[PDB]
Design an enzyme around this catalytic site. Structure first.
Site, PDB file in Angstrom:
ATOM      1  CG  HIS A  99      92.660 -32.390 -14.237  1.00 20.12           C
ATOM      2  ND1 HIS A  99      92.092 -33.116 -15.271  1.00 20.12           N
ATOM      3  CD2 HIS A  99      92.823 -33.237 -13.206  1.00 20.12           C
ATOM      4  CE1 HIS A  99      92.017 -34.393 -14.895  1.00 20.12           C
ATOM      5  NE2 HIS A  99      92.460 -34.491 -13.661  1.00 20.12           N
ATOM      6  CG  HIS A 138      92.357 -24.216  -9.335  1.00 18.33           C
ATOM      7  ND1 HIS A 138      91.826 -24.472  -8.098  1.00 18.33           N
ATOM      8  CD2 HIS A 138      91.350 -24.150 -10.232  1.00 18.33           C
ATOM      9  CE1 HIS A 138      90.480 -24.525  -8.273  1.00 18.33           C
ATOM     10  NE2 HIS A 138      90.169 -24.294  -9.566  1.00 18.33           N
ATOM     11  CG  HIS A 153      89.004 -23.170 -14.357  1.00 20.41           C
ATOM     12  ND1 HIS A 153      88.935 -24.560 -14.377  1.00 20.41           N
ATOM     13  CD2 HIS A 153      88.863 -22.786 -13.089  1.00 20.41           C
ATOM     14  CE1 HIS A 153      88.613 -24.978 -13.140  1.00 20.41           C
ATOM     15  NE2 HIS A 153      88.634 -23.931 -12.323  1.00 20.41           N
ATOM     16  CD  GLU A 173      85.552 -23.642 -14.290  1.00 22.21           C
ATOM     17  OE1 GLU A 173      85.449 -23.509 -13.071  1.00 22.21           O
ATOM     18  OE2 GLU A 173      85.817 -24.725 -14.882  1.00 22.21           O
ATOM     19  CG  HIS A 193      88.000 -21.109  -9.269  1.00 22.00           C
ATOM     20  ND1 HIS A 193      87.573 -22.137 -10.097  1.00 22.00           N
ATOM     21  CD2 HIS A 193      87.248 -20.042  -9.623  1.00 22.00           C
ATOM     22  CE1 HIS A 193      86.639 -21.706 -10.913  1.00 22.00           C
ATOM     23  NE2 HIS A 193      86.407 -20.452 -10.629  1.00 22.00           N
ATOM     24  CB  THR A 224      83.846 -25.855 -11.616  1.00 17.87           C
ATOM     25  OG1 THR A 224      85.277 -25.622 -11.574  1.00 17.87           O
ATOM     26  CG2 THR A 224      83.082 -24.767 -10.986  1.00 17.87           C
ATOM     27  CB  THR A 225      87.273 -30.332 -11.460  1.00 18.18           C
ATOM     28  OG1 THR A 225      87.638 -30.206 -10.099  1.00 18.18           O
ATOM     29  CG2 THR A 225      87.855 -29.152 -12.149  1.00 18.18           C
TER      30      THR A 225
HETATM   31  O1  LIG Z   1      88.258 -26.513  -7.654  1.00 22.89           O
HETATM   32  C1  LIG Z   1      87.752 -27.643  -7.977  1.00 22.89           C
HETATM   33  O2  LIG Z   1      86.744 -27.719  -8.657  1.00 22.89           O
HETATM   34  C2  LIG Z   1      88.191 -28.945  -7.408  1.00 22.89           C
HETATM   35  C3  LIG Z   1      87.729 -30.154  -7.942  1.00 22.89           C
HETATM   36  C4  LIG Z   1      88.161 -31.363  -7.373  1.00 22.89           C
HETATM   37  C5  LIG Z   1      89.021 -31.385  -6.297  1.00 22.89           C
HETATM   38  C6  LIG Z   1      89.441 -30.195  -5.813  1.00 22.89           C
HETATM   39  C7  LIG Z   1      89.009 -28.976  -6.319  1.00 22.89           C
HETATM   40  S1  LIG Z   1      89.538 -27.475  -5.649  1.00 22.89           S
HETATM   41 ZN   LIG Z   2      88.356 -24.007 -10.334  1.00 22.11          ZN
END
Ligand SMILES: O=C(O)c1ccccc1S
Ligand SMILES: [Zn+2]
Length: 257
Positions: free
Chosen positions: A61, A91, A93, A103, A116, A195-196
């Site tokens: 991802h 991480h 996007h 996002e 993020h 947001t995932t």
């Molecule tokens: O940043 C995200 O949206 C996330 C989504 C699912 C699991 C961990 C994370 S950190």
């Molecule tokens: Zn994120």
């Protein structure tokens, strides 16, 4: 499983994760004219001097830089937050083109990417118990625009060719996340979600107003990663952003006048 393609992307996520259509989903558009200055906000403290990075991972991802969160080492406090939140990972996007990739949006403007930095509330003991709580997480969101290079990003860019495909990881010790912060900590805040998937509604979002600049060459290297695993057809890792969701019964507050 879920992803960012035509048949498994954001508009499908609700089927497995019904909270996708919940009451405090993220990201959102930040309408700067509607956001109100909030004098009850305490000063924000980003304390990253003892951060211990460990590893970088392509999870099919995005890529995650993971930190040792076994002690109070890199923490976020103050601003909207009650108590101490410990950094666990960061991480990004990003887009296939510089005109898209963030996002959150600011008056509908999309930036080329968004960082993020994810933290969990230490009152809950571990990240797993924090994501069962409405104030379990705090995410510091930072926009990236394309312009001058960000020197403190280059160590990340230069490791990417070693984690090209899903499931690959590399050592990533001694990385200092302070090098990813803009000059100003002015920010917007609101209650939202991951947001995932699984899209959990645990997050106090703190979105910095000032973007960081990265170079076109830095962001091009992000776009050379792959969603697929080794030995599978190449699908470039691009456009791994969720679009803005309904604000519903929420107000965005500004830390600045
Ligand atoms: O940043 C995200 O949206 C996330 C989504 C699912 C699991 C961990 C994370 S950190
Ligand atoms: Zn994120």
């Amino acid at each position: 499983h879920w992803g960012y393609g035509k048949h498994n992307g954001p508009e499908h996520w609700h089927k497995d994760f019904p909270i996708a259509k919940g009451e405090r989903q993220s990201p959102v558009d930040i309408d700067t004219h509607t956001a109100k200055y909030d004098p009850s906000l305490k000063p924000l403290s980003v304390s990253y001097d003892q951060a211990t990075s460990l590893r970088i991972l392509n999870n099919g991802h995005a890529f995650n830089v993971e930190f040792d969160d076994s002690q109070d080492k890199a923490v976020l406090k103050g601003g909207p937050l009650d108590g101490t939140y410990r950094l666990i990972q960061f991480h990004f996007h990003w887009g296939s083109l510089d005109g898209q990739g963030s996002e959150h949006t600011v008056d509908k403007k999309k930036y080329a990417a968004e960082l993020h930095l994810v933290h969990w509330n230490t009152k809950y003991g571990d990240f797993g118990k924090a994501v069962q709580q409405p104030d379990g997480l705090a995410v510091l969101g930072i926009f990236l625009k394309v312009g001058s290079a960000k020197p403190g990003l280059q160590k990340v860019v230069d490791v990417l060719d070693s984690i090209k495909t899903k499931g690959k990881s590399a050592d990533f010790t001694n990385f200092d996340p302070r090098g990813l912060l803009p000059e100003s900590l002015d920010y917007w805040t609101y209650p939202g979600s991951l947001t995932t998937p699984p899209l959990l509604e645990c997050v106090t979002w703190i979105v910095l107003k000032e973007p960081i600049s990265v170079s076109s060459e830095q962001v091009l290297k992000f776009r050379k990663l792959n969603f697929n695993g080794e030995g599978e057809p190449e699908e470039l890792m691009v456009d791994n952003w969720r679009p803005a969701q309904p604000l519903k019964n929420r107000q965005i507050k500004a830390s600045f006048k």
